[PDB]
A = this chain, B = another copy of it.
């Protein structure tokens, strides 16, 4: 009984630590890919309703970075800062639309 609850506590600590570590690794990889080599990972899609084409950035990993509000908010805000364009996250894609 108490062994199972102790294992729950230990595994919750371990899983939360691993989840935050994976989220940090994912945001690290996302921003590093955008800053260094985004050409092999990004495409361009023309939204005709807004009569403009947007940069579709599809990061390789999606497991944990969007589940953490802080990591996702930082990713969006820093992509907006470094790029200067309006960045909106939809599903697994970052949409860069020139402002």
Question: Which chain A residues have a beta carbon within 8 Å of chain B's beta carbons?
Answer: 1-5, 7-9, 11-13, 15-17, 19-21, 24, 28, 31, 34-36, 38-39, 42, 44, 46, 48-49, 51-53, 55, 64, 67-68, 70-71, 73-74, 77-78, 81-85, 96, 98
| Contacts A15-B44, A51-B67 supplied; 13 other A-B pairs, CB < 8 Å | A1-B36, A4-B55, A5-B83, A5-B84, A5-B85, A7-B44, A8-B44, A8-B96, A12-B53, A19-B51, A24-B82, A70-B77, A70-B81
User: Measured between alpha carbons, how far is A34 from B2 in the docked complex, in Å?
Assistant: 10
Give A69 Cβ to nearest chain B Cβ, in Å: 9
Contact between chains at A67 and B48 (CB < 8 Å): yes
